């Protein structure tokens, strides 16, 4: 018009970030008193609000520092606030409110607010006509301009409103975006839950799992779904038997005293205790400080033992007594284990080893004792005669192998001595009768990996109850023998056999010490210590899971490891199609398939809490009566409720009627509402103290037309309790009701190909039908009509297949055609009636077994006259055209 900005010259505010200015700055400016100042230029966003700017600094010297929030208020004299809901349902008539603000202290502005057109939405605004309202906004006041729209397609849609003031160089606009959600209700279907365990559930080391597509029989037409494939590792702790409590070993710490034999007896407990405590790491409970005192006892025992070392490097109870083979071998056994604790002279250790080999070993590989020890109780099980050569040779051999890593470089004959000693055990092992010898000899052989076949079988079978090696006599020999067996099993890596054996040792509740306990004490703790050392931190978890989606280019593999076991790995697919899951490797995992989709809601999603009935009738330049009825759906009456009412364009409530409603009667109307003149009063709020849940609470008032327009927007009424805004009920009202509503007519434009059979010609049909786009053409009879709240289903019977494509439907079969309720009035389909239908391939819905059709904008739906009507001369033209059309398609088909 005149004195106003052109719509095209106005650029609406679109930048409304909830957060921005995510930038970085470096204070490199010359410091003033340690403070550097930097001027930063920024461009403010479109949002009309206060910004809170937070700043954090990092310095090499000063460190981190968080500054106080600095606020920035951004405002305009004239602006628009377009209040859009987070999301709106498709094909549901909703009302949005555009509020115009004028903060000029004392100056009224004449504004023309316009709602731009958008193919996605259906409003009074069209490509042909603009939707404009000219309103007056008083100073220090705001005006609410209602808008009724209907979303057509789902997804992030855009709404834009512009405005310009007359006689002033001022303009503004808002361009926000809202989400459009399908009519259905969000739902999740657990398709499959499979445990992944290749080694255990799979074949040849691989496990295959075929997953079915989701049912989705109730899925809302023309809505996409998404299937999640969730993979997660299953961490499994290693079941390891608890270690012997450190407090139990307080007695093991002993001060070494006596001569050549007793010095070792007292040194044994302390050495094995410090060894066990180190492995199990229990110095925390035992006493961190105490360890040093223990080592001093070990050094003390070592130093004193040297005094009994003879020139031959052998050992005996006395310096004048003949050297003992066993004693010397034992000294090597303990000393070799103590090299980790204290300083052990190689010359002493290796010297004893070389003496045992060159002086005490026979050509056959047997070690012989020429001078038994005085303390026969310190030798443990070796004391019970019988197969002494096997027992003694094994004992000495064990000592040699433990000293190998230390004395192999100094003793050239050691490797041969070990092999020759093993040769003897290997040859005479099967003859052994006593469990003790079998246990100790088995361990010696196992060290070389020479315990195989029959020998291994004998060793394992000798154990009673698969948990212990025992013999008639003192228990200490059994505990000792079983300890040797445990060490052998650990050497064999036989994890299956160990647990019962270890459990038996622990249940014996033996913690060393006492008379004749040297061997039992030393062996039991060495075996238990080794068990803890070999024990794995956790069960191995290294799965290789791969997904095979029929619609994916290549396989998707996932490497599931222990460190990332809990990590939830996901794969998403739009298509509802079966797939295969292959997993292989060690460890366990979980496979879950869930499908999110919109399922048709049989019940009403809206107005679940409030019942609302709005009626509009002509009053006895115009007047009408607006009567609103409401009832609360609950066990008790509702609390204070709000009546958000919006007038029809050009209409306003009566001041007199409002005053009468304002008067008590549990109805409150703020004075602010009462004051507004008949002009610019398109919004009204009526507060109710409470509404009945037993019956309807009805109120009514008059409305007067002040402004005259061609296209009249329908009014709206919203009821809801103060505490809950979500649970509300909105009803629209408009004259001509006791469809012409532009909003109603616009919505049904894309229901199907709109046309009159009269304008339609034979040649026209042949031209359109043969087009490659058209996939199917059927002569159908409507067998049944199943109406619903959101989508109507029409069960069509295929009487003739004029043209068939993807859907290989035979004559006599039935197909279901679907269409939104908004199109029911436009289609006007009736049972027992025939129709000529054709459409695109994109119309298909579901899969082959239950393939359905969706009546879209490109769908041709022409009523086929019955034989009764065809006899009429007026219907002759159409009946004959349809007949010739069918003949040309069936006989000749399409050109090519």
């Amino acid at each position: 018009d005149e004195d106003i900005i052109a719509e095209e010259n106005i650029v609406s505010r679109s930048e409304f970030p909830e957060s921005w200015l995510w930038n970085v700055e470096d204070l490199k400016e010359p410091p003033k008193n340690g403070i550097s100042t930097k001027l930063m230029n920024i461009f403010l966003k479109d949002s009309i609000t206060t910004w809170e700017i937070l700043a954090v600094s990092m310095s090499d010297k000063k460190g981190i520092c968080v500054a106080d929030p600095f606020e920035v208020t951004v405002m305009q004299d004239f602006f628009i606030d377009l209040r859009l809901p987070y999301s709106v349902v498709r094909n549901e008539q909703v009302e949005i409110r555009a509020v115009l603000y004028n903060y000029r202290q004392n100056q009224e502005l004449k504004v023309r607010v316009e709602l731009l057109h958008n193919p996605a939405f259906c409003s009074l605004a069209t490509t042909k006509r603009r939707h404009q309202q000219t309103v007056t906004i008083p100073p220090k006041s705001s005006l609410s301009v209602p808008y009724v729209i209907v979303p057509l397609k789902t997804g992030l849609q855009e709404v834009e409103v512009k405005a310009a003031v007359y006689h002033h160089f001022i303009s503004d606009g808002v361009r926000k975006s809202l989400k459009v959600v399908p009519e259905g209700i969000r739902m999740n279907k657990t398709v499959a839950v499979r445990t992944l365990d290749p080694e255990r559930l799979g074949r040849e080391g691989v496990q295959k799992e075929d997953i079915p597509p989701a049912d989705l029989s109730d899925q809302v037409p023309d809505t996409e779904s998404e299937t999640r494939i969730l993979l997660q590792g299953t961490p499994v702790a290693q079941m390891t038997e608890d270690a012997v409590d450190a407090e139990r070993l307080k007695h093991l710490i002993v001060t070494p005293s006596g001569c050549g034999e007793q010095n070792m007896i007292g040194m044994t407990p302390t050495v094995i205790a410090v060894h066990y405590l180190d492995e199990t790491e229990q110095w925390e409970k035992f006493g961190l400080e105490k360890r040093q005192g223990a080592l001093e006892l070990i050094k003390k025992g070592y130093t004193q033992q040297l005094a009994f070392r003879q020139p031959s490097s052998a050992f005996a109870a006395f310096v004048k007594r003949a050297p003992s083979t066993w004693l010397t071998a034992y000294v090597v056994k303990v000393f070799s284990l103590a090299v980790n604790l204290i300083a052990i002279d190689s010359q002493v250790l290796c010297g004893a080893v070389k003496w045992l080999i060159l002086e005490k070993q026979k050509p056959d590989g047997v070690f012989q004792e020429d001078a038994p020890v005085i303390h026969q109780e310190m030798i443990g099980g070796l004391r019970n005669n019988n197969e002494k050569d096997m027992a003694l040779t094994a004992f000495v051999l064990i000592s040699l192998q433990e000293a190998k890593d230390i004395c192999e470089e100094q003793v050239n004959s050691l490797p041969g001595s070990i092999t020759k000693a093993g040769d003897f055990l290997e040859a005479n092992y099967m003859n052994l009768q006593r469990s003790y010898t079998v246990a100790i000899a088995g361990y010696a052989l196992a060290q070389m990996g020479r315990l195989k076949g029959p020998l291994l079988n004998k060793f394992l079978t000798t154990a009673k109850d698969k948990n212990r090696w025992e013999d008639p006599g003192k228990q200490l020999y059994n505990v000792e023998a079983t300890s040797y067996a445990l060490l052998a099993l650990l050497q064999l890596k036989d994890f299956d056999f160990v647990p019962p054996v270890v459990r038996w040792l622990n249940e014996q509740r033996y913690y060393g010490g006492g008379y004749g306990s040297t061997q039992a004490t030393f062996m039991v703790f060495q075996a238990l210590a080794q068990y803890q050392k070999d024990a794995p931190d956790h069960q191995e978890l290294n799965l290789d899971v791969s997904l095979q989606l029929p619609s994916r280019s290549s396989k998707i593999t996932h490497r599931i490891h222990w460190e990332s076991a809990s990590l939830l790995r996901s794969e998403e697919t739009k298509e509802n199609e079966g797939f295969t899951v292959t997993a292989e490797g060690k460890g366990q995992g979980t496979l879950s398939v869930v499908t999110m989709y919109h399922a048709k809601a049989k019940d009403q999603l809206t107005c679940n809490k409030f019942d609302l009935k709005v009626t509009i009738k002509p009053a006895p330049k115009n007047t009408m009566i607006l009567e609103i009825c409401t009832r609360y759906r609950g066990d008790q009456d509702a609390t204070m409720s709000i009546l958000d009412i919006s007038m029809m364009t050009g209409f306003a409530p009566d001041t007199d009627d409002l005053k009468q409603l304002a008067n008590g009667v549990d109805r409150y109307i703020s004075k602010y509402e009462l004051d507004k003149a008949f002009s610019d009063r398109n919004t009204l709020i009526i507060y109710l103290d409470k509404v009945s849940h037993s019956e309807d609470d009805c109120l009514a008032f008059k409305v007067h037309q002040y402004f005259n327009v061609e296209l009249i927007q329908p009014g709206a009424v919203k009821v809801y309790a103060y505490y809950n805004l979500e649970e509300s009920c909105t009803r629209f009202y408009h004259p001509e009701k006791e469809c012409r509503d532009e909003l109603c007519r616009c919505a049904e434009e894309n229901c199907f190909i709109q046309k009159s059979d009269d304008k339609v010609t034979l040649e026209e049909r042949l031209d359109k039908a043969c087009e490659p786009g058209v996939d199917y053409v059927y002569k159908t009879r409507l067998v049944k009509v199943q109406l619903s709240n959101d989508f109507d289903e029409y069960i069509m019977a295929i009487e003739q297949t004029i043209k068939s494509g993807s859907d290989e439907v035979q004559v006599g079969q039935q197909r279901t055609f679907i269409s939104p309720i908004k199109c029911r009035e436009a289609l006007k389909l009736e049972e027992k009636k025939h129709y000529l239908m054709w459409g695109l391939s994109s119309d298909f819905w579901g899969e082959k077994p239950n393939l359905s059709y969706i009546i879209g904008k490109d769908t041709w739906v022409e009523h086929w006259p019955e034989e009764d009507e065809c006899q009429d001369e007026e219907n002759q033209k159409q009946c004959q055209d349809l007949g010739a059309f069918t003949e040309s398609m069936v006989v000749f088909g399409c050109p090519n």
Binding site: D3, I4, A6, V11, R13, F43, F169, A343, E409
Partner: protein, 245 residues
């Protein structure tokens, strides 16, 4: 008057102007040139031997273009002014570790609107890394040979009996190259330790994993704690030592 309405610097004529002399009170409508806005046509009129301005107050100003828009991981500056008006350019720049997709990094505010599209910034990426022989990649966000991006770090661990050779960790640097070179996994070995104030008892120099090195101390010195060393993936544990005592 006796001429044709003057050609303004920012306005344009709408009439054909074929006549020579024009009657009194004749309004010469001036349209607003592209990239400019106003309430209406700045209308001139002929009176008193000159073309005066019927609309003195009404004037054409530079057409305002909306916000150029911000791109993820990027910032922009304005060129040729400090307002989003016709004739200004919005130059974009990607953040550290981000590279500009394309070579057009600007948006020029033109008569209709901003020119081009909002420049896109993409995080720099480094070539995928494979597992070293006899070694594995403990770190990383899974996925075998998936191109990493700025920031991601990678660690390497060798299998039992093997020790790494080179840097243990690395990360995708700013230019899309790894901060360090990929390491190798070499079989564990140890050279014969030089014991200060002491001498080796053994003659062997090369040692494998878990092999023990024996040594004695020169007179006047004695063992610092233990009396031997063990070969490990990290070296000799403990290290040979002789303290005065």
């Amino acid at each position: 008057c006796n001429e044709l309405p003057p050609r303004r610097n920012t306005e344009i004529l709408t009439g054909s102007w074929s006549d020579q002399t024009y009657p009194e009170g004749t309004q010469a409508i001036y349209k607003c040139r592209p990239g400019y806005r106003s309430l209406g046509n700045i209308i001139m009129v002929c009176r008193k031997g000159e073309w005066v301005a019927l609309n003195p107050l009404r004037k054409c100003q530079k057409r305002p273009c909306g916000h150029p828009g911000d791109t993820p991981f990027g910032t922009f500056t304005l060129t040729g002014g400090n307002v989003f008006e016709y004739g200004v350019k919005a130059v974009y720049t990607c953040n550290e570790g981000y590279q500009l997709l394309g070579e057009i990094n600007y948006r020029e505010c033109d008569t209709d609107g901003w020119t081009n599209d909002i420049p896109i910034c993409e995080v720099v990426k480094c070539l995928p890394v494979t597992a070293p022989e006899n070694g594995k990649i403990v770190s990383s966000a899974m996925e075998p040979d998936r191109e990493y991006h700025f920031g991601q770090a990678v660690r390497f661990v060798c299998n039992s009996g093997y020790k790494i050779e080179g840097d243990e960790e690395m990360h995708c640097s700013d230019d899309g190259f790894w901060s360090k070179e990929k390491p190798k996994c070499v079989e564990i070995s140890c050279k014969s330790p030089d014991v200060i104030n002491g001498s080796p008892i053994s003659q062997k120099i090369i040692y494998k994993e878990n092999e023990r090195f024996q040594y004695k101390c020169n007179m006047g010195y004695e063992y610092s704690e233990r009396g031997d060393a063990v070969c490990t993936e990290s070296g000799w544990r403990p290290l040979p030592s002789c303290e005065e005592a």
